[PDB]
Every structure is written in C-alpha cells, then in structure tokens.
Structure 1
Amino acid sequence: TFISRFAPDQPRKGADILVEALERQGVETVFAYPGGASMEIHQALTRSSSIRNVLPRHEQGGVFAAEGYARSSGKPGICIATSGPGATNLVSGLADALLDSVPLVAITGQVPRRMIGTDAFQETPIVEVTRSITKHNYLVMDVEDIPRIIEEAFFLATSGRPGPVLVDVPKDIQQQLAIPNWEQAMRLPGYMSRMPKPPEDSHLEQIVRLISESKKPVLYVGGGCLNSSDELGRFVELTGIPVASTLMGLGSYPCDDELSLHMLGMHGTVYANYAVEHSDLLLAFGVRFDDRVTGKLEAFASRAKIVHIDIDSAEIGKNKTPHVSVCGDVKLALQGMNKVLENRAEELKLDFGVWRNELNVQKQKFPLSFKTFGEAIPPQYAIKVLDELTDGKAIISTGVGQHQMWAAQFYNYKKPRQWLSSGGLGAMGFGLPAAIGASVANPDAIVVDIDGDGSFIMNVQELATIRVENLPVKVLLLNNQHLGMVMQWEDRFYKANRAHTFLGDPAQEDEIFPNMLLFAAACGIPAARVTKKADLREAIQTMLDTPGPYLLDVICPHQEHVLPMIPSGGTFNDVITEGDGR
C-alpha cells in the first residue's frame, strides 16, 4: 500500500495534499520554477522524499523538459510554474504537447480566489488562455477537490489520445488545512463512456481479407504506434508489407530494416512517397493525415483502399476519407490481426515480393544523397557518424529546421522514444530542454541534442540546468549561421533574397557568431569546435567519451538544402530532387 507522511486524521495544507496526490500517481520528477503564487507548493516539495525537482532557468525550458521526459519514457511529464508571467511562459509547451499528443500535467499557482478577476498582482486568466491549446484544464475552487482533480488530470493526460492538462491552483487553496479523501470518484461520465472499446473480430478480419486481395500494400505508421513496436514488427513478419513512417512515428519500425521505406511526406524519401502514390492498400495506423505528409489531399494515395485505425474518432475521416475504419488502440488491433494471420497463414499465401522489388528499384535509383565539398563538413555526414559511433542507440532530440530533417533522415532509430522532435507545432528551442527531460528519465542512456544555431540559442539558458543537475547531455550543434529552413525557401521561391535569416554578425561576416563555446564555458560545460571533415569523427568520439555534458560546434556550409522536397500542397509529380543555394 501507499505510505503517507501524514496521519489519516491529521489536517495538512492543500499544497501538501497536492504533492501527496502526485506521489500517489507515481510521480518521481517534476520541473518546477518558484514564484509567489506557488511558494507553498515548493515548500511542500522539499517535504517529499520521493519527488525530485529539476529547476529550469525558464518556464518554457520547464515545460519542454517535461515533454522530453514524457516522450522518452511513456510517463506523463509534470511541470510547475507560478501565476502570471510563469504561467504564460508555459504556453508554447502546452500547444506543442497538444499538437503532438504528448501526455503532460501542468500545475500553475494562482492568486487567491477572492482576487480572481480584479487585475490582481501577477494575475492572468490562464484557464481562459489555454482552453484551446490543452486537452482539458481546471481551476481548483476548493481544497477538497485537489485529490479528485489531480487524479482526473493524470487520467485525461494519459488515456485515449494523450495530451496536456493544466491545473490552476489559487494560493489560498494551497494554504488551507484539510484532511484529503483519496477515495473520491472521478467526474468524467461522458469521456469515460465514449472511450474506444477493444476492436471487434468483425472489423479485424475484414482488414486481413483486404490485405490478401491487394497487390501493392503500404504501411503508413505514425506517432500512435509508439507503444506497438513489438506488435507492429510481428505484423510485418506475417505480411511482408513495407513500412513508411511519419516524422512522429520514426523508430516504431526499425529504420535499418530492409522492409523500411523510411520517412514519407514533404521531405520524405522518393521511394516512400512512390509507394504511397502507387499503392492499392494503405494501412494508416496511428496517423492523422497531416498536410506535411499528404500534400494535395485528392492526389494522396489516389488509387488505394485506405484502412485507418485511430484511437480518436474525430480524426477518422477528417482530411482523407477512408474505406475501412477501426476506432481503437492500434496495439490491440495489431494483436488481433496477428492471431488471424498466424492461424490462416497457409490459407492466405501472402507474398508481395513483386511489389517490394518494384519499390527496391526506386530505392536504388533515388536514395538519400548529399555532396561533400572539399574539407567542409556535410551536416548529413555528421549525423551518420553519430549514428555509427553510438550504434543507433542514442536518444535524439532536435530543434526545428534543416538540422531536424537531417536528424530524421540520417539516423537509424531502432526503437520508438529515441526520437524526440516537435512535429506539429515545430517549436524552436525544444531540443536542449527536451534532452534534459530525457536524460533525467533515462539516466544510463546516450542523450544527444542535434540542434541548430537559431534553435539552440533560444533556450541556451538551460545549459545552467544541465551543469547544476550534472546531466550527461551531448549537444551536436549543426552551425550554418542561418535560419536554415527559411533560407532554403528564400532560395527556392524568393530568388535568394535574404530577409533576416542570417544569424551572424554582419560587421565580421566571416566569423562564427555568436561563439557557442563560450556559452558552454559560462556554465562549466566542456566544448569544442570542428570545421574540417577530417577532424569530425574524432571530435564526435571525444564528445561521447568525455563524461558528463559536452557541446560540439559543427560548422557547416549554409548553402545545403534538405532534399527531396514536395512543395506545400503539391503532388508526387512535383517532387524536387536536386539543387541547393550554390
């Protein structure tokens, strides 16, 4: 049973009830930054012997760290901020967690209840601000509600389609004395009654039947499969269907595998987008048919029967209309379909080697390619060397931009939750704090933040967090001195007319600005810069072998372009396969 630090008849502060509510959820780590409206919560945290606090240097760092914790572990991430300016600094993280379906519980202090609505000191209506960028939120109006609301928040954040839940706690409720009741029933009758049931054998056998009748099936795998790598891998054994993955699904099926078509979509491989373009059966498991993937919807999988299995009924038929649909956990659907495939194996005689051979011809004519100019370091090459020296077992977090795409293309993720990247919102500054959360959740792992120079500086203050918490976070900084992805679009569509994409100092144009090594130096983090491709392998090896945190500044020619590229709203026939800024 659970052991409380208080007697069952002993009144204690609401802040102490809230912390014990976290303890009763199995919480061991929080990311909490103190302020006036949350001082009581922070005092109660020091009284907890089972919950560790990682103090960020910015609440956006706190929420992004909670995301990295969640994405790398499957557990909910918990961040805590004070009222007013603390709460508003969470907003980008809440939106990011909602768009990527990341389970997250955010607790904000609030001004006393009687002060609400009066423009009080450090008051913002955070429940109103965040209603459209959270899965649910609460304003606690009585200390007796703390056990129930915390329980509901964790249940909502982690069940169904996961997402962020914000709990706003007025300071007077934190100080009120009460005796908690941990037996209160949750008040989610509508939500709980609309929870998907395990899929029926009726629907599952229709799918297995559709597979046997098809000649060109393609698996279309996304973020919803992160807990189904075993079931999915078994499914691929029994069917031999090639696997195309989204940015969010990377690693659900191993990238180094022969049946892997790698990533599809705007910057997906030519052969992955080819497969979807010419398929007759599209198995869309745990995906939401977003515009980065589909392009022009009418042309996406235009001659395929579309099977869509999603745990969110609101996603089924939202953009692309499926032929067959299953609303439920893809993990269960895979388990059920795997049994059918095992028994009726010899009756089905599944063989797609002719389709696979057609795709492997595309895989040989159009592989992912990069150019090497003299001794300049290709960013693609740097990530490939990191893959080798870490044996593809590192947890990878990124910023947003060209380096993000290259980290997606040129690292072979073997398991899900190695890949931590902001996909739906695409928020710069995510990589460094996310690596902080992933390292705390996986203390023995290799954690590398593959960051861009614009993204890295946005939350550079979290270097102090990495040092103080003694986290072995590695930073592989692909430094092209530009806002690279926006620069690439300037080259393609605006005649290379630069509009504020250069991040260096124009007074000293040929100097690396700023000097990221001194940012690491300021926080006592060893660092180095590498410029010549000949030095890169030993440089990365040094970063990995040096215990504790390390920053490697990898200088790269800025004229590189992420390829291939299907322009926004385009079709497969519009794919760009050559060119850069030279």
Structure 2
Amino acid sequence: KTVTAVELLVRQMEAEGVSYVFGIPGGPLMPLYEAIFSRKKIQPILTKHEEGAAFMAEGYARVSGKLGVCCATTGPGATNALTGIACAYSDSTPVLLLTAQVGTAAFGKGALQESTVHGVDLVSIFSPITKLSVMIPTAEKMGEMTRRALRTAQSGRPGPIHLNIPADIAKHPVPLEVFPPMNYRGGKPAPTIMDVVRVAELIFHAKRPAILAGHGIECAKAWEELLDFAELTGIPVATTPKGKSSFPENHALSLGVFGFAGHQKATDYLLSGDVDVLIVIGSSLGDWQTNSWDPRLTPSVALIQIDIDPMEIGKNYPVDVGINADASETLKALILCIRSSGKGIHPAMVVEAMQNRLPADTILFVDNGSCINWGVHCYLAQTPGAFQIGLGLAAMGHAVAAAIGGKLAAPDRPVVALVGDAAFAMNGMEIHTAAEYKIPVTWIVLNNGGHGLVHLGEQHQFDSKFDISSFRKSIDFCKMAESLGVKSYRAETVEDFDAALKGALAMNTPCLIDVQVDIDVLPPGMKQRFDMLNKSY
C-alpha cells in the first residue's frame, strides 16, 4: 500500500494527535491542503497573516500540551511566519512549521519565490531559531524526516521545527508506513537516586527553604506534582513571571511572582538573605526572572536547580545540586523519597473587574506592553497553566493571535486576551479568523492611543524631549471589529466594562472590548525597572 509523500506526512501528524494546521495556502503548498482535505481529520485554519498562523500554533501547543502545526508557501509566506517561530523557540514550545519549496528542476534558475541558497534561503534563515531546519531531499525520505522533526520538537527542551518540502516530491508515491509516537522518540530523564537523597536531606535540615518555579513546570506538565511536593514539605513557592499559573496563587504556600512586575511578598522572601535552601525548577534564570541577576538571590546554604536542559544549569548562579532531569520526574522521585522517609479606566480596576467576573477555569492570554505589568502583578491565577504570556521574546501581537489557538485547544473553557492597542494594530486582523470559524475569544484592548511603555520611557529616561509613541488619532476598535464581523463594546467606565465582559462571556461568539485607558498611568514595577535600560546605555 502506497500513498503520496505529503499524505504520509499528514497521516504521521495524525498519529501524534495533531488536530489543526494553521496557515495560508500557496501554489507550491497546494498538495498539502489536497492531502489534508482528503483525510478529513486534521482541520486547516486559514489565517490573515502567516505570523498569525505561527502565533496560533504556538497558542494551541501551549494550551493543549501537544504539537502545534502551521504551514506557509515559498518565500514571503515562510518569512512572514518567522517571528511566531522565534517566539516558540524562546518559550520552548513544540511548533512544526511546514513550508513549500519550488520543484528541484528549477533550482538556481530564478524560480518564482525560489527558496534555496540561490534565492531566499529559508532553511538557513530558520536555522538559528529552530531545533531543526531542513529540506526534505526525496520523497523516500519523507517518513524518516517527519519522525525526526516530531522526535526533535518534543524531546529534551521542547522547541520548533522547520520542514521545507519541494513541490515535486510532495506527490510522489511512498510506502504507507506510520508509527505510534513511542516507537521513534524516547522517554524523559529522571534524577539519580543520590541526587534525590541529597535534596531530601537539604530540605529536612533547611530552616527557611523556598521554591522558584518557572515555565518548565508547564513544559513538564508538573503542576500537581509541584503542588503535592510543596504541601508535603511546607516549602513556599514563588514563580517567574512567565511561570505564573504554575502554582495556585490563592494557596497558603504561594509567594506570588518573583521578578519583573512581581509581588513584594516574593521579593522580601527571596532577596531577604534569610533563605538557606533555594530550589529552582524549570527556569532559565534570565533578566526578568532574577531582577537582572541580583546577587541576593543566592541562598545561604544550597542552590538546587532542576532543568531538562543541561546547558542552563549553573549558567548565572553557581549550583550546589544541579539536576538534569524532567521536572515532573524529579518531583515524583522527591515526593516518594520524602513520603517513604516518614520525616479613562485605571487598568488596575479593569483587572479587578475581570477577576470578579471571569470563571475560575478561564485561560488568560496576555500581550506585551503595559499589559505585562497589569496582568502579572494584578491578576490572581488559581488554575494550572491558565496564565499564558510569551515573555521569552515578548513579541507584540503574540497574545492577540495565540488566544485563538488556545481556544481551539480548550473549547470547553473561557479564553480572554488582555492586549494593548498598538499590539492589536499589529495582528488584530486575526479576529476575522475567529469570526470565520466561530471561535469564541474575548479581546480586551487597553486603548491608550499609542505605545504606553514607550511613552513612559520618553518621560522617565529622555526628559520628554521627543514623542514617537502617541497617536494623533486613536484607532476605533469597535468599528474595526464591526468591519471584521466581530461584536464590540466600548468601555469608558468600569460599570460599562463589567457589562461588556458579562455580555461577552455569555455570547458564544468572538467579541472585542475597547477600554479607554490613560497613557500616562505608571504600571507596577515599571518605575523600579527603567534603570536597567539606563544602565545599559
């Protein structure tokens, strides 16, 4: 039994549990769509921009805990996706990007949108921000290369893949051989028994232990192991900003967010100098995770760092126990050992009204801009994985589009995106996509008529000497939503906002809420933060 190479690719994605392929067609890509529509299993989602498709696949992957897939044509289709894939790379999200390539017979002749070394070399452009970027050389190799891509994306530190597919091989016949995922990728690494024993001993004798949980908790699906571990030991848990929702913030052991826009309670605990044993789980300990590598984060007695990526361990802080292992496998081992032992509207008011009306199981997507500060600082995240923020690359527009992918991954749950107006101008056209497929997402646009953080930067770092941040005329997002077939509310009082949010939650359609916001409002942690840029200059 034979199938086209591209159908084999689609069938192998089927066995990984892939449900959607986000993208925009093109001539050389049409065999992929022909295969998808023939199989009636994976559903294609047409987006407005391939960057939006990459964002959506990234949002789908993070919420589903599965592989996200997007596709793009030769040349400018693929290059349009790059920012989204770079975000996936920075956030360790498994996203597979399928791109088309011209036929082999046209290499080096000036083919339309030629995407080889002789034209626009997509394989090379994507190499720095993917775990693997490769062109399928022959139809016979489609199988091996697809399994390689799927194994690479989801093994070790997860990350995106770029697979480039020449249009002439795509429909060549190949043996129909699909494998279950267990047969072509391996399991997760665990800690050694001696490392488990040594950590348990450090915990038993510690007089002021603490946990810093990062985004690796989501990557590892380690939420309930982390919660059980903390309750079993009494150890309080802080999270990184991106790590928000790894631990329930209404829990008695929750310190809140440590770092940028974080909570005084976490800062006091971890920088006091009193913590003797600090356990870092799944954080790369970059700038915003550490208040620019504050030396006071160093504990008194031992720093324990657990990471699946051995290159992150001991990078910025010397470690006393450095565990290279999956976070959930490490926490399980620790639990077992310890147990068997026996031993306009102010944005803060906006967030507050959201907290009072949003169901507990709401998945909140937050963009990049002042909404980082307001969401990270002012929103209480009780549900595991329910706070979705892209802080690895912090690309404007990420949350605007990724929330659509998130809703497709969790159709039973409310999905809300908190975004700025300039971010919405970058990728807000995608709400037309939500309208087209009736994907109920609510966008809350903090409409401050320009680039808030930039505006505040001009005031605090540049003496208000110039303005490259304020629009001379704010965008009317309700009219824009109307033009794209999405219901809208304008909110200028918190009462109007609450009525809009309550209408939007009930409606079963996409909806947009245009919130009037003062561009001069100083968001939490921003004041304390400008100095790093000043220090940099």
TM-score (norm 2): 0.93
- The counterpart of 2:338, out of the listed 341, 351, 357, is 341
**Residues 188-226 of structure 1, C-alpha deviation per residue, up to 9 Å, x if partnerless?**
9xx97xx86321221011111112222222210001111
In structure 1, the partner of 2:496 is 535
Q: Decide which moves more: 12-21 or 446-455.
A: 12-21
For 2:189 and 2:447, the matched residues in 1 are separated by 49
In 1, are the aligned partners of 2:303 and 2:321 still within 8 Å (CA)? yes
In 2, are the aligned partners of 1:295 and 1:568 still within 8 Å (CA)? no
1:385 aligns with 2:353: yes
Correspondence 1:404-423 to 2 at 5 A = 404-423=372-391
1:514 aligns with 2:485: no
Query: Cα distance 1:549–1:197, how it changes in 2: closer, same or farther (>3 A)?
Result: closer
How much has 1:259 moved relative to structure 2? 1.6
- The counterpart of 2:17, out of the listed 26, 30, 37, is 26
In 1, are the aligned partners of 2:261 and 2:376 still within 8 Å (CA)? no
In structure 1, the partner of 2:40 is 49
In structure 2, the partner of 1:5 is none
**Residues 65-98 of structure 1, C-alpha deviation per residue, up to 9 Å, x if partnerless?**
0011011110110001111011101110111101
Q: How big is the alpha-carbon RMSD for the aligned residues of Structure 1 and Structure 2?
A: 2.2
For 1:117 and 1:328, the matched residues in 2 are separated by 46
For 1:521 and 1:297, the matched residues in 2 are separated by 46
- The counterpart of 1:62, out of the listed 36, 41, 53, is 53
Q: Decide which moves more: 266-275 or 120-129.
A: 266-275
For 1:297 and 1:528, the matched residues in 2 are separated by 43
For 2:205 and 2:181, the matched residues in 1 are separated by 49
In 2, are the aligned partners of 1:482 and 1:502 still within 8 Å (CA)? yes
How much has 1:476 moved relative to structure 2? 1.0
In 1, are the aligned partners of 2:88 and 2:160 still within 8 Å (CA)? yes
Correspondence 1:185-196 to 2 at 5 A = none
Query: Cα distance 1:498–1:260, how it changes in 2: closer, same or farther (>3 A)?
Result: farther
**Residues 126-162 of structure 1, C-alpha deviation per residue, up to 9 Å, x if partnerless?**
1100111111122100101111111121111112111
In structure 1, the partner of 2:264 is 270
How much has 1:303 moved relative to structure 2? 4.1
Correspondence 1:306-317 to 2 at 5 A = 306-317=303-314
Correspondence 1:550-569 to 2 at 5 A = 550-565=511-526, 566-567=528-529
In structure 2, the partner of 1:438 is 406
Aligned residues: 522
Question: What SS is found at the alignment partner of 1:291?
Answer: coil
Query: Cα distance 1:339–1:97, how it changes in 2: closer, same or farther (>3 A)?
Result: same
In structure 1, the partner of 2:29 is 38
For 2:466 and 2:407, the matched residues in 1 are separated by 38
Structure 1 runs not aligned, ≥5 long? 1-7, 348-375, 506-512, 575-582
Query: Cα distance 1:204–1:19, how it changes in 2: closer, same or farther (>3 A)?
Result: same
One-letter amino acid matched to 1:561: L
In structure 2, the partner of 1:212 is 204
For 1:258 and 1:134, the matched residues in 2 are separated by 40
For 1:119 and 1:245, the matched residues in 2 are separated by 52
How much has 1:471 moved relative to structure 2? 0.8
One-letter amino acid matched to 2:467: A
1:258 aligns with 2:249: no
In 1, are the aligned partners of 2:5 and 2:169 still within 8 Å (CA)? yes
Structure 2 runs not aligned, ≥5 long? 115-119
Correspondence 1:80-91 to 2 at 5 A = 80-91=71-82
- The counterpart of 1:284, out of the listed 280, 286, 301, is 280
Correspondence 1:318-337 to 2 at 5 A = 318-337=315-334
1:93 aligns with 2:84: yes
- The counterpart of 2:123, out of the listed 124, 127, 137, is 127
In 1, are the aligned partners of 2:241 and 2:289 still within 8 Å (CA)? no
In structure 2, the partner of 1:403 is 371
For 2:422 and 2:336, the matched residues in 1 are separated by 49
In 2, are the aligned partners of 1:28 and 1:51 still within 8 Å (CA)? yes
- The counterpart of 2:446, out of the listed 478, 489, 503, is 478
In structure 1, the partner of 2:134 is 138
One-letter amino acid matched to 1:280: D
Query: Cα distance 1:138–1:110, how it changes in 2: closer, same or farther (>3 A)?
Result: same
Query: Cα distance 1:410–1:338, how it changes in 2: closer, same or farther (>3 A)?
Result: same
In 2, are the aligned partners of 1:451 and 1:475 still within 8 Å (CA)? yes
Query: Cα distance 1:114–1:318, how it changes in 2: closer, same or farther (>3 A)?
Result: farther
For 2:530 and 2:267, the matched residues in 1 are separated by 14
For 1:489 and 1:392, the matched residues in 2 are separated by 35
In 2, are the aligned partners of 1:151 and 1:186 still within 8 Å (CA)? no
1:494 aligns with 2:462: yes
How much has 1:454 moved relative to structure 2? 0.6
How much has 1:170 moved relative to structure 2? 0.5
For 1:413 and 1:498, the matched residues in 2 are separated by 38
In structure 2, the partner of 1:350 is none
Query: Cα distance 1:449–1:197, how it changes in 2: closer, same or farther (>3 A)?
Result: closer
For 1:466 and 1:186, the matched residues in 2 are separated by 34
Question: What SS is found at the alignment partner of 1:439?
Answer: helix
1:242 aligns with 2:236: yes
**Residues 388-418 of structure 1, C-alpha deviation per residue, up to 9 Å, x if partnerless?**
2123321111221111221122222223332
In 2, are the aligned partners of 1:148 and 1:185 still within 8 Å (CA)? no
In structure 2, the partner of 1:79 is 70
How much has 1:536 moved relative to structure 2? 2.6
Q: Decide which moves more: 272-281 or 491-500.
A: 491-500
Q: Decide which moves more: 307-316 or 208-217.
A: 208-217
In structure 2, the partner of 1:172 is 168
For 1:109 and 1:163, the matched residues in 2 are separated by 21
Query: Cα distance 1:377–1:568, how it changes in 2: closer, same or farther (>3 A)?
Result: closer
For 2:288 and 2:465, the matched residues in 1 are separated by 25
In structure 2, the partner of 1:352 is none
**Residues 229-267 of structure 1, C-alpha deviation per residue, up to 9 Å, x if partnerless?**
111111111111111101221111101222211111122
How much has 1:119 moved relative to structure 2? 4.0
In structure 2, the partner of 1:151 is 147
In 2, are the aligned partners of 1:15 and 1:175 still within 8 Å (CA)? yes
